[PDB]
Design a binder for this molecule. Structure first.
Ligand SMILES: CCCCCCCCCCCCCCCCCC(=O)OC[C@H](COP(=O)([O-])OCC(O)COP(=O)([O-])OC[C@@H](COC(=O)CCCCCCCCCCCCCCCCC)OC(=O)CCCCCCCCCCCCCCCCC)OC(=O)CCCCCCCCCCCCCCCCC
Ligand SMILES: CCCCCCCCCCCCCCCCC[C@@H](O)O[C@H](CO[C@H](O)CCCCCCCCCCCCCCC)COP(=O)(O)OCC[N+](C)(C)C
Ligand SMILES: CCCCCCCC/C=C\CCCCCCCC(=O)OC[C@H](COP(=O)(O)OCCN)OC(=O)CCCCCCC/C=C\CCCCCCCC
Ligand SMILES: CCCCCCCC/C=C\CCCCCCCC(=O)OC[C@H](COP(=O)(O)OCCN)OC(=O)CCCCCCC/C=C\CCCCCCCC
Ligand SMILES: CCCCCCCCCCCC(=O)SCCNC(=O)CCNC(=O)[C@H](O)C(C)(C)COP(=O)(O)O
Lengths: 84, 459, 55, 103, 178, 124, 70, 128, 88
């Protein structure tokens, strides 16, 4: 069993520089009379599920919300059990 | 002791009256049976010895060497079967006759209650080996090698003979038992110094000592496979056996006289180990490794302590087996490639995997991996040397490091990497060759289960 | 629970005059603590290898 | 730059030869022609053959051969604390000196 | 690799090699894609400034300062593709590569399995046996006297011809034999 | 740390050498000079076979801690009070060592002040 | 061993919900454990016993005489 | 300008920093052409012998034979006793022996003097 | 590994994709056999950039001696297929 499903490529016209740091690169290059030719070859790295980013502290706090909720529930349960 | 000597003599009429196509089978079967018979001399005593008669006696130094000598002949026959296939029947029978004569001389040499009888047989071994090297060797240098191998030996052996007869004129006997029981101190005199040198140099040249080791790479590179096997396994150990036997009458002069030989050995082991690192020939590399191991054995015998003697015995047996295996592996490569150059045939692990396993095991045992008997002897000698002087540990550790280095270098150069493209005649390894390697290696790993059998009379 | 400590000298290998060599195992705190950890790590590593070295 | 016409033609011929060879490397449906000839449960049998039998052998060997000799298995002499009683003798270890206890 | 080398590299070959090497080391320094794009456009603008230069002595004085600058700022740990001569899997699969002649030494019981494969194998062997005797003559007649000057081989020029010395190129083991 | 800075960058004789402490008689300060109290005896403290470096004036609390750890084995959170007691006794021991260091330092200070006062009186 | 997931070629890879839920569960478990241990045993990090001030000890309890007695 | 790279024995000069490659003259180009011609002739001979379907063995290499023979058997006939050779031989073959002899002799003399004086403390030293 | 067995068609589409994302070429004038220097009016530096784009897109790098003589998309596809042992 292997992956023989006839994968097709997306549309090359989809990749655009707008809304990406490549746009800033192109704008900065234009101030010197230059232009970036391979920009759209790099656009897919900022387009889909790769568009949203997380910070370092956000990465370290990957599951702090659920753990904190469980901690509060547990400490409340212990408080209501010991005080009996 | 005749129960071993007579069957060895009967090997000759059985060989010469055999059929043209039955010589190898019969010789191998009866040599294996003789080995089985000789295996019952390992039952030694903590008392004196097994004094069979006035002429022959057995010792726990003699018995392991005798068993190894008997066990080596069948392996030599198996190894010689291949390259002697296109040979006439008479000349094959003559080759087998040389092998049988060499075994008989070695067996009588190792028992030999007399020092003159020991000398006579010790030198009688010189003739069949010389014929084997100069007759069935491939290269044009074999003759030269034989010359070296001869004269070196005699250069040391004629003075010994003189000293020997001189001793009997003063002591009245050369029997090992009377010599040991009636030993008297040797005064620090010029006459006694030269008597000491005459007694030692004959066995020193055969180890070989580092200064006098030039004949050995020549003889091993030039000799056929069986010649190399017997030279590396048994003939080098004659010097160690003789030194252990004869140093009993050389005290206390050994304390002063041993210094030059100790320095030569401790530095030449480093020298020959480093030589092994830059060697373009497998046989030459294995010969230099043998020189290093025998340098360690010389140090052990010169230190002359119980642990030294135990380690020397263990190392002699272990090196005999390991070096014979290494020569056999190199010869299996040579019979395919016809070059004997290490760099030529490469990446053989991909083409011959089981033979690569044999190479790995042989390299590991040459490297002295515990708890192999190679390391048992190495460690006992090293501890004795440390007690002798704590600074020897530097040279011993350097020797261990360099030994590991060239052993794994030899393994990696031949077995690892990419195969040579233009070599296409590499056939699958034969059952004969695999069985030869197994019959070398299983006895070593069995001996590590019962080390006291090879630790000598001081155990 | 109790702190049980042992030495197990089971097989006597060669004896060298006054020196005796034997197959002996020390089962102190270090051994009985490190063996389970190493076994657990090796178990995880082998399970990982059946996926990593499949080809 | 680029390929010379001879280089192009040689590459084309070598390419078609190589592709033929590679296609020929494929196996037919019958290719591994194998000649046959003969002369909870899984974990249960694994535990019996790989744990129970070795532990039986080792326990027998330790209990009846190794401990036949002296000093082969040496224990620790377990700790004794005040207030304990010993199974062998039955006597009680005296307590402490009732030190001043606070906090 | 496949193409034969020449006696020397021309000036424009050296310039293009420096261009490729400098951009690779620049992207090694510039990890992120947009930063690399910006600095690569700057590097290209710096290269094409002297693009139309006609003084070859001055052009060779250039490219020398350029290679000295490259060696000064060359990123001592550049990125290498894993299978490239410095990569982490450069010769990883060479131990799985076995020559095609080894199959000649298989036991008949081994060749009994895979009969179609071996039949195609003798087909290939017959092809080689005829083509070779033709190829030796073709190479002999095509080679200038005094020996070859460049290690390039001719194509097949007739109809039934095969390219000379084709066997060990066509029957390469594989990139990933196992 | 501050004492290291004072000793290595200031006057060395101002503060003690930790290897040679103490350099003054015990009863030099006050004559009451009570001696330390030891609760665990020789034999019981040997039978517990604690360690040679664990055999200090805190030994009995360690005996009780070990006694709990043995008795309530599966509940390895059972005895926490005796852990606190042993820690507190060790804390008191360290505080006493700190007081010894401070006392020796102040005695050195006062001795140097007496020496300089004697020098000033001699010069006067 | 697992499920079949096809390559994607310049788009975000296909994600199973099982791996997301397990990763989130284990991250939350670690954070809950840290919070629980800090709540129950905070003196292993902050310390429990005060550190005394050497200068706060009077000469009376430290055995010092007013520079003339001895 | 940038800091200079200085080559060494174990860190050689890079190819792209050689003044030689940038000094192109017709004799240099001719030398390169002849070098390539020699290499191509050798390659042609090797591949002709390599692709041969009738060849069933090692392709013997005269260069390898020359290398091994020069390394092993051509040394002594080309040896000449020279001040450099004599001094290096004497040093490297005698000096270490006497150095080690002095070291070990001094060590054992100190040990022997200590054991005669009785201040060696050889307790529990049973195995030697 | 679990690497799909890429085919000649996949290599061709990926090469043409990478070329169509290069804005110096208008995609409707591009073709499989279109020469880089003359049919597309590109400089040698552009060819070096295209070779590096192919290297970064296929995960392996082409030696300069081979790379400098790849002037068509079909040539690049052929070289990649021969390197990767592609059957069909
Ligand atoms: C660890 C305990 C194991 C117990 C199980 C029993 C094992 C019995 C083995 C007996 C000796 C081996 C015989 C040598 C020939 C090899 C056999 C062969 O032809 O292989 C084909 C066979 C078929 O496979 P194949 O696919 O057809 O062949 C493909 C190729 O051959 C490619 O094959 P490959 O790639 O698979 O490699 C072949 C393999 C096999 O090749 C070898 O290298 C084996 C030899 C290794 C020793 C090297 C010399 C050093 C001296 C040590 C002396 C130890 C001997 C002890 C007594 C021995 C009694 C005779 O090599 C290795 O795997 C490397 C192993 C490195 C071992 C280093 C560790 C040494 C010290 C270990 C402790 C020993 C004492 C413990 C004391 C304290 C605790 C009680 O493969 C095997 O059977 C492999 C053998 C098993 C590996 C041996 C490693 C452990 C055994 C050590 C010796 C006995 C230990 C006793 C203690 C018990 C408690
Ligand atoms: C070449 C490859 C290796 C071959 C084997 C080499 C090993 C052989 C080395 C020989 C061992 C040493 C020989 C004699 C040792 C005795 C110690 C003596 O030589 O040293 C001093 C002796 O002083 C001088 O050395 C006198 C001898 C000087 C003449 C010898 C020549 C020196 C260099 C020659 C070396 C050549 C060796 C090879 C010859 C072919 C000691 O002072 P002294 O207290 O008074 O004598 C005590 C001994 N007594 C009581 C018996 C008298
Ligand atoms: C050749 C001439 C060698 C000269 C050496 C002289 C040695 C000698 O004569 O000692 C004799 C001595 C006893 O002295 P007496 O004369 O009997 O009486 C003395 C008290 N009144 O007897 C012996 O020990 C004889 C032993 C043989 C002497 C040694 C001859 C050769 C030199 C020693 C061997 C070392 C060289 C070995 C070469 C190794 C090459 C691989
Ligand atoms: C297993 C198959 C049989 C299963 C049923 C029987 C179960 C075991 C009962 C057998 C009885 C025990 C027994 O065999 O007797 C001891 C018997 C040997 O006889 P002894 O006289 O005790 O040893 C000689 C010194 N006195 O023990 C054994 O040898 C077998 C088990 C011992 C361990 C095996 C060896 C493993 C190590 C290999 C070599 C390693 C290197 C050397 C050790 C280095 C240590 C410094
Ligand atoms: C981070 C690492 C540090 C790297 C720093 C390296 C220094 C960068 C600056 C390099 C300086 C130069 O331009 S070096 C100047 C060398 N001389 C010339 O360029 C003269 C003629 N130019 C050519 O012939 C070219 O090949 C060309 C026409 C461009 C293409 O040709 P195609 O038509 O065949 O594509």
């Amino acid at each position: 069993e292997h992956g023989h499903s006839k994968m097709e490529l997306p549309d090359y016209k989809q990749w655009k520089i707008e809304g990406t740091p490549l746009e800033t690169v192109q704008e900065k290059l234009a101030a010197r009379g230059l232009r970036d030719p391979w920009g759209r070859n790099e656009a897919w790295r900022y387009s889909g599920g790769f568009a949203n980013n997380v910070s370092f502290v956000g990465a370290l706090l990957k599951g702090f919300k659920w753990g904190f909720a469980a901690f509060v529930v547990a400490v409340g349960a212990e408080y209501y059990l010991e005080s009996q | 002791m005749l129960k071993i000597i007579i069957p060895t003599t009967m090997l000759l009429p059985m060989t010469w009256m055999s059929k043209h196509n039955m010589i190898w089978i019969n010789a191998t079967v009866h040599s294996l049976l003789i080995s089985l018979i000789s295996l019952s001399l390992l039952n030694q005593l903590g008392e004196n010895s097994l004094n069979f008669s006035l002429t022959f006696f057995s010792d726990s130094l003699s018995a392991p060497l005798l068993v190894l000598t008997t066990w080596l002949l069948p392996l030599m026959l198996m190894a010689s079967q291949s390259h002697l296939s296109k040979e006439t029947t008479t000349r094959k029978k003559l080759y087998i006759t040389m092998l049988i004569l060499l075994q008989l001389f070695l067996i009588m040499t190792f028992t030999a209650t007399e020092l003159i009888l020991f000398y006579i047989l010790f030198e009688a071994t010189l003739v069949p080996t010389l014929i084997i090297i100069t007759r069935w060797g491939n290269q044009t240098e074999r003759l030269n090698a034989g010359l070296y191998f001869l004269f070196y030996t005699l250069a040391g052996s004629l003075p010994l003979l003189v000293a020997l007869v001189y001793i009997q004129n003063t002591t009245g006997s050369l029997n090992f038992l009377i010599i040991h029981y009636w030993s008297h101190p040797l005064s620090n005199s010029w006459s006694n110094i030269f008597m000491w040198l005459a007694c030692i140099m004959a066995f020193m040249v055969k180890m070989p000592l580092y200064g006098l080791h030039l004949w050995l790479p020549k003889a091993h590179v030039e000799a056929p496979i069986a010649g190399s096997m017997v030279l590396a396994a048994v003939l080098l150990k004659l010097g160690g056996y003789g030194m252990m036997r004869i140093t009993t009458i050389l005290n206390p002069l050994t304390n002063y006289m041993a210094y030059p030989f100790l320095m030569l050995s401790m530095w030449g082991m480093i020298m020959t180990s480093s030589i092994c690192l830059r060697q373009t020939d497998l046989k030459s590399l294995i010969a230099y490794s043998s020189v290093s191991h025998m340098a360690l054995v010389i140090v052990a015998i010169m230190i002359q302590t119980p642990w030294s003697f135990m380690g020397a015995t263990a190392l002699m047996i272990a090196h005999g087996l390991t070096s014979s295996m290494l020569f056999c592996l190199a010869n299996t490569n040579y019979e395919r490639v016809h070059s004997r150059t290490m760099i030529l045939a490469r990446g053989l692990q991909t083409l011959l995997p089981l033979m690569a396993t044999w190479w790995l095991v042989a390299s590991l045992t040459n490297l002295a991996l515990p708890p192999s008997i190679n390391l048992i002897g190495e460690l006992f000698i090293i501890t004795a040397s440390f007690s002798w002087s704590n600074i020897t540990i530097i040279l011993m550790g350097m020797n261990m490091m360099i030994t590991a280095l060239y052993s794994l270098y030899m393994l990696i150069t031949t077995q690892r990497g990419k195969y040579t493209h233009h070599i296409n005649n590499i056939k699958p390894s034969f059952t004969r060759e695999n069985a030869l390697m197994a019959l070398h290696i299983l006895p070593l790993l069995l001996l590590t289960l019962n080390p006291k059998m090879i630790l000598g009379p001081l155990y | 629970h109790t702190g049980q400590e042992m030495i197990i000298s089971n097989w006597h290998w060669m004896t060298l005059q006054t020196v005796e060599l034997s197959l002996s195992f020390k089962m102190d705190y270090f051994s009985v603590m490190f063996i389970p950890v190493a076994l657990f790590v090796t178990w995880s590593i082998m399970e990982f290898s059946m996926w990593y070295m499949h080809s | 730059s680029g390929y010379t016409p001879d280089e192009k033609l040689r590459l084309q011929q070598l390419r078609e030869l190589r592709r033929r060879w590679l296609k020929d490397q494929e196996l037919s449906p019958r290719e591994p022609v194998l000649p046959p000839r003969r002369v909870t449960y899984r974990h249960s049998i694994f535990a019996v053959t790989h744990v129970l039998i070795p532990v039986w052998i080792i326990h027998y060997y330790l209990k009846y051969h190794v401990t036949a000799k002296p000093y082969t298995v040496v224990e620790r002499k377990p700790r004794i604390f005040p207030g304990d009683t010993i199974l062998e003798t039955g006597e009680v270890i005296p307590l402490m000196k009732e030190f001043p206890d606070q906090h | 690799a496949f193409s034969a080398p020449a006696a020397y590299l021309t000036h424009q070959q050296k310039v293009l090699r420096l261009y490729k090497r400098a951009l690779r080391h620049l992207e090694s320094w510039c990890v992120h894609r947009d930063k690399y794009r910006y600095f690569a456009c700057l590097m290209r603008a710096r290269f094409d400034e002297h693009k139309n230069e006609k003084d070859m002595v001055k052009a060779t004085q250039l490219l020398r300062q350029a290679e000295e600058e490259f060696w000064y700022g060359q990123h001592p740990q550049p990125y290498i593709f894993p299978e490239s001569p410095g990569g982490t899997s450069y010769e990883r699969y060479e131990c799985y590569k076995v020559p095609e002649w080894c199959l000649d030494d298989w036991h008949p019981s081994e060749k009994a399995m895979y009969p179609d494969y071996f039949a195609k194998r003798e087909q290939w062997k017959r092809l080689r046996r005829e083509s070779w005797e033709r190829e030796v003559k073709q190479l002999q007649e095509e080679t200038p006297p005094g020996g070859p000057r460049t290690e390039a081989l001719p194509p097949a020029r007739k109809e039934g011809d095969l390219p000379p010395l084709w066997w060990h190129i066509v029957t390469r083991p594989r990139e990933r034999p196992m | 740390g501050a004492h290291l800075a004072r000793r290595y960058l200031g006057d060395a004789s101002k503060e003690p050498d930790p290897l040679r402490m103490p350099t003054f008689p015990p009863d030099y300060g006050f004559p009451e000079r009570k001696e330390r109290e030891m609760v665990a005896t020789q034999q019981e403290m040997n039978d517990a076979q604690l360690m040679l470096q664990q055999r200090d004036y805190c030994a009995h609390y360690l005996i009780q801690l070990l006694k709990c750890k043995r008795d309530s084995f599966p509940n390895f959170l059972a005895c926490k009070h005796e852990q606190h007691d042993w820690d507190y006794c060790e804390h008191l021991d360290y505080v006493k060592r700190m007081k010894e260091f401070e006392r020796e330092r102040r005695l050195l200070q006062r001795k140097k002040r007496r020496e300089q006062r004697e020098a000033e009186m001699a010069r006067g | 061993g697992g499920v079949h997931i096809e390559p994607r070629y310049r788009q975000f890879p296909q994600l199973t919900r099982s791996q997301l839920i397990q990763a989130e569960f284990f991250s939350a478990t670690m954070w809950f454990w840290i919070l629980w241990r800090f709540w129950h045993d905070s003196d292993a990090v902050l310390g429990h016993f005060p550190y005394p001030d050497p200068s706060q000890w009077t000469d009376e309890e430290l055995g010092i005489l007013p520079d003339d007695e001895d | 300008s940038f800091p200079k790279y200085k080559p060494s024995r174990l860190a050689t000069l890079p190819a792209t920093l050689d003044p030689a490659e940038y000094d192109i003259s017709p004799e240099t180009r001719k030398a390169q052409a002849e070098r390539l011609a020699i290499r191509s002739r050798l390659k042609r001979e090797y591949l002709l012998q390599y692709n041969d379907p009738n060849r069933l063995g090692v392709i013997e290499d005269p260069a390898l034979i020359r290398w091994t023979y020069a390394r092993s058997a051509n040394i002594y006939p080309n040896f000449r006793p020279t001040p450099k050779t004599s001094l290096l031989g004497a040093l490297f073959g005698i000096g270490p022996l006497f150095f080690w002899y002095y070291v070990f002799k001094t060590d054992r003399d100190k040990k022997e003097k200590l054991i005669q004086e009785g201040k060696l403390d050889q307790t529990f030293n049973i195995s030697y | 590994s679990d690497a799909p067995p890429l085919t000649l068609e996949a290599i061709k589409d990926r090469v043409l994709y990478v070329l169509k994302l290069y804005d110096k070429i208008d995609p409707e004038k591009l073709s499989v056999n279109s020469h880089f220097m003359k049919d597309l009016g590109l400089d040698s530096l552009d060819q070096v950039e295209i070779i590096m784009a192919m290297e970064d897109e296929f995960g392996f790098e082409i030696p300069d001696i081979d790379a400098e003589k790849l002037m068509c998309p079909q040539e690049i596809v052929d070289y990649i297929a021969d390197k990767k042992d592609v059957y069909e």
